[PDB]
Curated annotation (Swiss-Prot), chains A, C:
Changing R141L: In Legnano; O(2) affinity up. Changing D94A: In Bassett; markedly reduced oxygen affinity. Changing G59V: In Tottori; unstable. Changing G15R: In Ottawa/Siam. Red blood cells. InterPro entries: Globin (IPR000971), Globin-like_sf (IPR009050), Globin/Proto (IPR012292), Hemoglobin_a-typ (IPR002338), Hemoglobin_oxygen_transport (IPR050056), Hemoglobin_pi (IPR002339). The record marks 8-9, 13-14, 24-25, 29-30, 45-48, 52-53, 55-56, 59-60, 91-92, 106-109, 121-122, 133-134 as: (Microbial infection) Cleavage. The modification N6-acetyllysine is found at K16. This is Hemoglobin subunit alpha. Changing S102R: In Manitoba; slightly unstable.
Swiss-Prot record, chains B, D:
Changing L68P: In Mizuho; unstable. This is Hemoglobin subunit beta. Changing K66T: In Chico; O(2) affinity down. It comes from Homo sapiens (Human). Changing L88P: In Santa Ana; unstable. Changing L75P: In Atlanta; unstable. The record marks K59, K82, K95 as: Not glycated. Changing H97P: In Nagoya; O(2) affinity up; unstable. The lineage of its organism: Eukaryota, Metazoa, Chordata, Craniata, Vertebrata. Changing S9C: In Porto Alegre; O(2) affinity up. Changing A129V: In La Desirade; O(2) affinity down; unstable. Changing V11D: In Windsor; O(2) affinity up; unstable. Changing D94G: In Chandigarh.
Length: 141, 146, 141, 146
């Protein structure tokens, strides 16, 4: 679903993020790899060390994809079609892993947006990241 | 949940700084708000219709603080979370019938609240040590299901 | 998603079920209550004993709802709007419980459709029941 | 996983009837087919593109049978599934890095396969006892994560 108030929330909060979004992405990935070692399995070719240019570079790709979804929040399945195929059909990513990354993203946003991470925006943001994950696993369903 | 000396170091430096009268109430309000099915266990507490209803509920802050008490006990007792949680597990499983997945969720919104409160202090390694504690408490609690 | 082959599969298999669907529903509910006692929590006013006319009666309601979804498999969110509201917004049903009921439904169909529960139809049926659950929790998201 | 005498009665009468050369291969093929992410751990086995590719793969039937061997061991050892599963848990957690949720899924497709094979014999009570065994094996396997 995602109500009108959620859409406002997510847009405001991505707004605050602004030109840091890729930096927050690479931090989120780093949070996931350390916390949930099972996710590493999917990144055998990456170096996952603290300074990895690979983690940095991928963190931007993720941030851009989420930015595209915010921008196209009323037609996400289309916006994200390609990524759906890549993730569900090509890489076969275990869906449980989308919860873990959304969780690490929420933590990063809390670490960075003291004022804007209210309970209400937290709920919206969660609802937004579960919608993204439904679309990216939706080839499975 | 074993925890290397540097993890217990990370976990312990933060935990001491944690406003214990507050953080508990923030985790639980956020649980109810973000995952509203959990509200069914708390309908007694009264008015939970809005997020501001929830965060300002004195019963929410009072129960959050009990909950935080139990975490401090697990922190105190990593080497026997089982023994430590027997009566609570009994309570949540047998009596209340809470799905253990909601233990995981409570732990994860606790990690968000800690991130929210500590900002950059709450680095990825510190999070990773906290995700271990959180998971082990969730597991001791589900023990009676097991 | 649900491909064209899935739609064919689900329709064929619901076809075999035919006039037993309500009977299979009440069996499925009985399977869930015994196996997953935590789900009982939501049915304090029911008698959940083997012969309960209540379980029988509710098992038909569930079977009818799933029948409506099969019949309207390309526009499920609408078909199921009302039930969405009831389940996500009124009863606040924990979403994990939809996996448990879908699992008990699959078991019942395997118990009854020896020939038609092939691997392929099993996959379809799973995909169909997860789509139903996405729609019934979608008010949450 | 305690199991009352009538549950072990139910579990045990069925298990003895179970075609052990077959049922294992059916559970695993069905795992790969219904939950295709799991295929990533089995790409060695070769051609898994269609369901008929999968069910007729001789490597699928050979591994399913190993797996079933391990269940029979847990059935043999309910009172210490932990001890019984130490080396497997070590394997699946440490070495392979399997998410424990997939242990739950494997158990549940095993229950479908048993239902499929035993029909009405596989009553709701018999299922409920099997969901206990299944969960306890999934838990012993995840022990090393714990
Ligand atoms: C929030 C949902 C996610 C989004 C926004 C997302 C987005 C992306 C993007 C934009 C790419 C690049 C695709 C391309 O242009 O070729 C990518 C690749 C990939 N993603 Fe995701 N991803 C997400 C979740 C996941 C998760 C949960 C996993 C695994 C734990 C994962 C595993 C992969 C793999 C391994 C690739 C290929 C890596 C490579 O070869 O460079 N993704 N992801
Ligand atoms: C995993 C972390 C959890 C911890 C540490 C925990 C801890 C506690 C504590 C200390 C109490 C107070 C018990 C007493 O008065 O002695 C309690 C009670 C309660 N909790 Fe939890 N709990 C957890 C998760 C949950 C979840 C997710 C729910 C469901 C949404 C839940 C529902 C309740 C209820 C209903 C009570 C009151 C029981 C009664 O008064 O009969 N708890 N919990
Ligand atoms: C496969 C998805 C499900 C479908 C098809 C479904 C369908 C139904 C239907 C048709 C009703 C009657 C609504 C009305 O006409 O007023 C109902 C009611 C209800 N359902 Fe579901 N349901 C499903 C899943 C769940 C689950 C997983 C739970 C809980 C474990 C649940 C809990 C409830 C409750 C408690 C009610 C009200 C019971 C009563 O007061 O009669 N449902 N369900
Ligand atoms: C919960 C039930 C499971 C049981 C009882 C179990 C049991 C077994 C057994 C007995 C073996 C043979 C090991 C040996 O040769 O000694 C094995 C290996 C393996 N299983 Fe599992 N397993 C389970 C679930 C899973 C799941 C869900 C996956 C992931 C989809 C997985 C992936 C594998 C792989 C990759 C191996 C081969 C390891 C290697 O050769 O290095 N297993 N398992």
């Amino acid at each position: 679903v995602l109500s009108p108030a959620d859409k406002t929330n997510v847009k405001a909060a991505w707004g605050k993020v602004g030109a840091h979004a890729g930096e927050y992405g690479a931090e989120a990935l780093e949070r996931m790899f350390l916390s949930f070692p099972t996710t590493k399995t999917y990144f055998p070719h990456f170096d996952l060390s603290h300074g990895s240019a690979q983690v940095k570079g991928h963190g931007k790709k993720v941030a851009d994809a989420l930015t595209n979804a915010v921008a196209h929040v009323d037609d996400m399945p289309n916006a994200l079609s390609a990524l759906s195929d890549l993730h569900a059909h090509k890489l076969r990513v275990d869906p449980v892993n989308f919860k873990l990354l959304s969780h690490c993203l929420l933590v990063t946003l809390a670490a960075h947006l003291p004022a804007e991470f209210t309970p209400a925006v937290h709920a919206s943001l969660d609802k937004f990241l579960a919608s993204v994950s439904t679309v990216l696993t939706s080839k499975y369903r | 949940v074993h925890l290397t000396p540097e993890e217990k170091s990370a976990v312990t430096a933060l935990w001491g700084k944690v406003n214990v009268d507050e953080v508990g109430g923030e985790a639980l309000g956020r649980l109810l708000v973000v995952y509203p099915w959990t509200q069914r266990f708390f309908e007694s507490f009264g008015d939970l219709s809005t997020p501001d209803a929830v965060m300002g509920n004195p019963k929410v802050k009072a129960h959050g603080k009990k909950v935080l008490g139990a975490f401090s006990d697990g922190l105190a007792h990593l080497d026997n979370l089982k023994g430590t949680f027997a009566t609570l597990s009994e309570l949540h499983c047998d009596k209340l019938h809470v799905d253990p997945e909601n233990f995981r969720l409570l732990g994860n919104v606790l990690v968000c609240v800690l991130a929210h409160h500590f900002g950059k202090e709450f680095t990825p390694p510190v999070q990773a040590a906290y995700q271990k504690v959180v998971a082990g408490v969730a597991n001791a609690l589900a023990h009676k299901y097991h």
